[PDB]
Structure formats: structure tokens, C-alpha cells
Amino acid sequence: VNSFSGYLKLTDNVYIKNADIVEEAKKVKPTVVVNAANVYLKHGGGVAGALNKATNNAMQVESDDYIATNGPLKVGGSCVLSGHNLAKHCLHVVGPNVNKGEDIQLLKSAYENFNQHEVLLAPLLSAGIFGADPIHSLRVCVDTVRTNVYLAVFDKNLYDKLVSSFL
Template sequence: MVVAYKLSNGLEVILENGDITKVEADAIVNAANSYLSHGGGVALAIVRSGGYIIQEESDEYVRRNGPVPVGEVAVTTAGKLKARYVIHAVGPRYGIEGDDKLESAIRRSLEKADELKLSSIALPAISTGIYGYPYEICARIMSKVMKEYKPKFLKRILVVVYGDQAYSVFKKVFDNSLYMN
């Protein structure tokens, strides 16, 4: 299941139900924790598919720079993945840190892709797993950020969600917000 949206800022947004580790994009965004310990969910899937080098580089990043603040990002190579980079976005825990931190994590991911002069990025439903964010809130925030973003190099955003329920909610939100540019 795939649906595409063309935004007034020139971005093409593709919503897909699938495995983010299998998509073709210049960068894949990982829904990470502040210590970049990739022990479950999307993070573990990325390390399993891309190789332990991603965890090693993440550990080195934290050793050198300290924990990544909520709402911020860190970058590693992508190991054996089709992507060139993994952008590790630290999303908030629902009900603990605010929606502004989720907005920041998404926006910083897009900004980092532009800083790296990438044309495509794959985003998961950040913070909707163990951090408990409802799909609808994540989709609304993601939609807002993508519509407001002013890309420099970025042309395509793949929003890759896992499961029929997530896809259905994201599609409904995107149909209502992204078609009405």
C-alpha cells in the first residue's frame, strides 16, 4: 500500500506500509533514545539489517558528544542498508515531553538531510512505539512539519509505517491535510 502527495513546497511525500530497512532513500530515520541504544523496535530492525557498525558508531557518538537531547538528531553511516546514512531522531515520550519535541525531532531530521545534501529521506512514525504517541498525533505533527518545511536539496520524503492500523490512521490524516495545500 503506497500513496503519494505533492506539496506546494516542492516535496513529494510517499506514505508506505512496510519495512523501513528495505526502502531506497539517501537516509533512513531511526526512532532513537538519547543514548542511541538500539535495543528494540525500528532501532533494532535497523541495526539487524544494517549491521552492528551502526550501533558501534552510535556508541562512539554518545561517548564523544554525550546523550542526544530529546527533539534532536545524530547521524551515523547506514552499514549494509541501501541508504547512505541513518539519522537517529530522539523523539519524546507521550505525556512526559511535549509535542514540540516530536515536531523538533521530525524537523531536525529533514534539516539534517538537507545539511548532508540528500534528496530523499525515509521517516518512521517516531515515538509511536514504546514511547506511546498515538498515530494520529504523530501524523498531524509530521504533516505540519512537512508542509511548513523549506527544502534546499530534499525532494522526497518516504513516510514508512508498520502495520495496517498505522497506515490507515496516517493515510486519513495525510489525505485531510496534505491534499489541501
């Protein structure tokens, strides 16, 4: 039993809710919140901009030190950093950005990072400003993630479409 509330169960291990991931993280304080990161950990907009704003820019400060030491992530890759006031840990995961021409096949590799964590609060990777079809992202999530994932979808209209079209 965990503290996530109001989710629709899609499969054995995948759950979904119309929610602001920032507000959900602040309420649940999950062990792991997933950020929709880019390779530079520049948290300017979308989910990343919102999460970073909620940390009062502490996420960005920590991220800049990480990049200065380690260099950029790979598309499809991840790193574990602090969750600040939102979670114990933040798993920064880089899905392909279609608006940059990146290979959508890397979306499966991106979701594989979730399997290193028993339970996660997450957005749909490569959705939103990353330009992928969220219906496809949900399909890849369900077919790739084996650990327990609680998906927060900000847009109510999109949430209803994701549920109603789910196979």
C-alpha cells in the first residue's frame, strides 16, 4: 500500500491521474519524482521548468554543478539527483525531443530508466513541448516499465483522451 490517491489503474503496474505533477509531488512526497529533462539539465519550461520553479531554482543550481562535473546526459539516459522539497530523489530522464529531430525509438530506452526504481511519480516522457504523441508515449510506458508508475497528466482534455483510447 502507498499514498497515491485518485488514480485510474491501467495495468498491473501503471496508474494514471489528471494532476499537476508539482502539486502531486508536494502532497505525496514520493521516493522518486521523474523530471522531463534535457541533456543539459536546463530546466526552462514544460514539466522541468515547473518542477525547478517549485524548488526555488535549487534544482537548477544542483543540475549546473552536475553538468560541470559530468557533462551532458545522453538522449534516452538519466541521472538521480535530489528531490529537494518535492521528493526524496528526482530521476532526470531525457526522452527524445521531436522538435529537435531526435529518434522516437529512444523513447523506449528513456522509459527503461524507470525500472531501476520500485515506485515513481512521473509525467509522460517526450509529451508536451517535447513534441511526441502522448498516446504513443503511454503505450511505450505500459510496454516498457515493469515497476510501479503513477503518471500525472496536467491537461484534463488529454487525460480523458488517453483513458478513452487506451487498449
